[PDB]
Write a protein that binds this DNA or RNA. Structure first.
Ligand SMILES: [Cl-]
Ligand SMILES: [Cl-]
Ligand SMILES: [Cl-]
Ligand SMILES: [Cl-]
Ligand SMILES: [Mn+2]
Ligand SMILES: [Mn+2]
Ligand SMILES: [Mn+2]
Ligand SMILES: [Mn+2]
Ligand SMILES: [Mn+2]
Ligand SMILES: [Mn+2]
Ligand SMILES: [Mn+2]
Ligand SMILES: [Mn+2]
Ligand SMILES: [Mn+2]
Ligand SMILES: [Mn+2]
Ligand SMILES: [Mn+2]
Ligand SMILES: [Mn+2]
Lengths: 96, 79, 97, 93, 98, 83, 96, 100
DNA sequence: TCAATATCCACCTGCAGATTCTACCAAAAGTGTATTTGGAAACTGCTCCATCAAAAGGCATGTTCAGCTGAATTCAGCTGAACATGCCTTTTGATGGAGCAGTTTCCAAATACACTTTTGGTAGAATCTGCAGGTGGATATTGAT
DNA sequence: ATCAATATCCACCTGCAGATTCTACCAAAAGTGTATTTGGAAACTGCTCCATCAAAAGGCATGTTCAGCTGAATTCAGCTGAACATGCCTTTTGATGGAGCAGTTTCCAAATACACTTTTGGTAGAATCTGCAGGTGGATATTGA
């Protein structure tokens, strides 16, 4: 089967690898790099979706929309710092 | 007089999302000036990407890229 | 003959607008402005619908943020009324000036 | 023709943490922008790390030092965790 | 009888002076010592190239001097001449350092 | 070999005063000196954490000026002269 | 043991120095800075060049990439003049 | 065979076209690099350094010194609006600040 | 506190716009082989970092004092919010046409390679010299009266 | 409207700690012949993008009116700057061992480069479905008294 399933990841290890090669980042790419990088991307994705999931639940909503991603991010010290120079379209601003 | 198109009330609203409660009468023109420099800077970079690509249509990506280099990274329009 | 006290509505709009996420600059005028500024860099240019929408999004997000910093400066001057000097100081501490 | 995105992978992860929560198109747009960004930031730093050290290959070691440099404390711990975990589980198959 | 400059005269004299020079203003050793103390709290058994400590000081002073310029703008904006913590904080807040 | 402590106090009131001067500052409140020490510690920790991260990745025991130059670059405080 | 050569931009900077100011020197500490300057702008341009190329699914960086990288990177006048000097050198170079 | 002529001379430049063409390929910026690229970059690089040395050299003169030092560089960078913007987030070790 | 006016808040409700869902095909992604080579040991030369000594004078400390600055208070002019009005610019939306991004589809001009010379640059010797920093008049620049 | 104080300036001086030349290799540009591609031409073609037109529908431009905010004046407790005596401890010079970078070699585990095989993910027509945007009715919050 795929390397992702092998790494136990949802994210596309193979693609991350193809993307690391074609992106002129280095001449070669260790076998692990793709795996690692994909694990990290999935985790963070999970984190935001987890928080924005709650964002919609606390809003009596079942479908996550931008507003939710924005509320989850700005209301989280760490995510907020990681994305301090990023603006999420149609996300508005924290109330108060 | 297009810049005049960005109207007072529209600007009142922005300030309001900004949490501003009282607005001096001179903010309106002052705001258009900042607003104009902002678009001129972003667009100028954007259009430069357009011409590089030899196209005649500014694309949302040409804008996402401009914003990225102005340090105004935007999510939702192609990365 | 009912009237609201100065700024009672003001606070109300803040509550309103800090809860929604719609653009607050009317589309058409904004598009007209975008194209006019653009016509100074390259002529007879076309625009993806989405490019114009991205610009407005970026643009308004920026303004709302600058009004945030501006209000901090007005409050620093023990005022509740933002003024140009307030926008000016903010932009200078931000490095845009 | 073809325009790949991380949408599917995002959606899987979504269901894994909120089985009954859905996600709007625009929102998926934000998550893609998100992934691409971090992807670039991580790769970029790893790229730099190897160059500083005259190495010609970006290995998982580089990716993680890169992760420690980019991510805020706790976020970086867990990211390093999931990271070395996935590599480990992979080298055992 | 004894001569005595009025409050602030020496201050502007000092500004004219330090804005003319480029020498560091924090004492070398005290500073190198502060670096080692912070470094060590991150990693034990660490060594530093001489220039590494000077590079750090160069950055620190360049940063503190620049922060004070903004801090001063904040004070003047408050119709004050005496910079205060409020100011340093307003500056850093807009600088996006917080 | 001795314990290192309270070295933040090595940044003396007069040293902080001279910096404000180059910075164009006329008058200084009594509370500035400690806010400054506070702000300098944070700035330093952040540059050193990164520099040292750069150091370890190079599996070394000595922080080089390049380590610091790279650290500063990441922080958006590019330094010329040791580069 | 061979103290492995460390390339610099010193001799070129110095050459150029003599051109504009025939009787002026430069302390080693200023050459230090001048070197940092060159490597910096070099990285910014190659960087923007690299990216421009990637955005256009183009595998090779050409003088055109450099040029538009320059226009994106430098301000007004500085840009107008740099682009001239580069074009001038490129054509000079081709005609030889 | 024929005699060697450096690409810099062919380009009419003082900066090292060859070296730059090399740093480009080794810096992993793109799969491949065209003939012009380095020529064009070495030119731009050389032009900008001529520009700050012109202004720096004057700074030195204004301060009655014949050897440029970091402070002269800062003076040049900060008094020139464009250079200042270009290096608006760069800090010149040992250059002080403008007398404001 | 009363009382009228508006707001804001909830709980339902029904429809249309997006989501989901379903059914298929190049284009990546996984394999299996044969080579290539990056850079991890295993030394080890030797640059330069941590320390130790010692003496000295530049400066950091602490204290005394009172100049003048920041923080209250007041208060009056007038600027900016709330509003009910009236009109026109923006918004909505099929329509129809056309400029144009993308596609292929070529291939001649232009890189990449692989060797094989042929210098340009760089690391210390060696030969020079700004200018640091020591002094002294003369020129302000200040603060007392 | 000085003028005694004392800080600042600007030119003159000259040994030496750094800058500028002087040699020698040798690492890396150049020169060549050869194999591989990149990415501009030209017709082409669906497709978004633009130009209309057509309504209402708001939503913005206008003036009035006056609440209450800001900025000007005046006041003074006490914070913060200037001076000064004291003497710590940062600086400055110089020597020393040895940690630990950094230069070489040696040479496998791991990565690149085909060639094929599958498998997957993106795309273009069908079945739900989640809220948006209104109702209605009910306490709330706000302003006038
Ligand atoms: Cl790896
Ligand atoms: Cl103002
Ligand atoms: Cl304060
Ligand atoms: Cl080219
Ligand atoms: Mn000249
Ligand atoms: Mn090898
Ligand atoms: Mn003492
Ligand atoms: Mn008193
Ligand atoms: Mn005052
Ligand atoms: Mn056509
Ligand atoms: Mn030679
Ligand atoms: Mn002198
Ligand atoms: Mn009144
Ligand atoms: Mn050893
Ligand atoms: Mn499938
Ligand atoms: Mn609703």
């Amino acid at each position: 089967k795929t390397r992702s399933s092998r790494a136990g990841l949802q994210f596309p290890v193979g693609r991350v690898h193809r993307l690391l090669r074609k992106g002129n980042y280095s001449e070669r790419v260790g076998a692990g790099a793709p795996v690692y990088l994909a694990a990290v991307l999935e985790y963070l994705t999970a984190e935001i979706l987890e928080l924005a999931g709650n964002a919609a639940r606390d809003n009596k909503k079942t479908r996550i929309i931008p507003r939710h991603l924005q509320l989850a991010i700005r209301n989280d010290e760490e995510l907020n710092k990681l994305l301090g120079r990023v603006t999420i379209a149609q996300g508005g601003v924290l109330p108060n | 007089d297009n810049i005049q198109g960005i109207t007072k009330p529209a600007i009142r609203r922005l300030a309001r999302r900004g949490g501003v409660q009282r607005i001096s009468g001179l903010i309106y023109e002052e705001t258009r000036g900042v607003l104009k420099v902002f678009l001129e800077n972003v667009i100028r970079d954007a259009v430069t990407y357009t011409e590089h690509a030899k196209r005649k249509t500014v694309t949302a990506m040409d804008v996402v890229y401009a914003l990225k280099r102005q340090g105004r990274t935007l999510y939702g329009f192609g990365g | 003959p009912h009237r609201y006290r100065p700024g009672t509505v003001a606070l109300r709009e803040i509550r309103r607008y800090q809860k929604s996420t719609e653009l607050l600059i009317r589309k058409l005028p904004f598009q007209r402005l975008v194209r006019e500024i653009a016509q100074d860099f390259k002529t007879d240019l076309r625009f993806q619908s989405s490019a114009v929408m991205a610009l407005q999004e970026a643009c308004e997000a920026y303004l709302v943020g600058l009004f945030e910093d501006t209000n901090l400066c007005a409050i620093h001057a023990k005022r509740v009324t933002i003024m140009p000097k307030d926008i000016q100081l903010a932009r200078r501490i931000r490095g845009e000036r | 023709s073809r325009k790949e995105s991380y949408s599917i992978y995002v959606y899987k992860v979504l269901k894994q943490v909120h089985p009954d929560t859905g996600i709007s198109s625009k929102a998926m747009g934000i998550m893609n922008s998100f992934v691409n960004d971090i992807f670039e930031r991580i790769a970029g730093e790893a790229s730099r790390l190897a160059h500083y050290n005259k190495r010609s290959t970006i290995t998982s070691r580089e990716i993680q030092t890169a992760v420690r440099l980019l991510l805020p404390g706790e976020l970086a711990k867990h990211a390093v965790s999931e990271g070395t975990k996935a590599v480990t589980k992979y080298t055992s198959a």
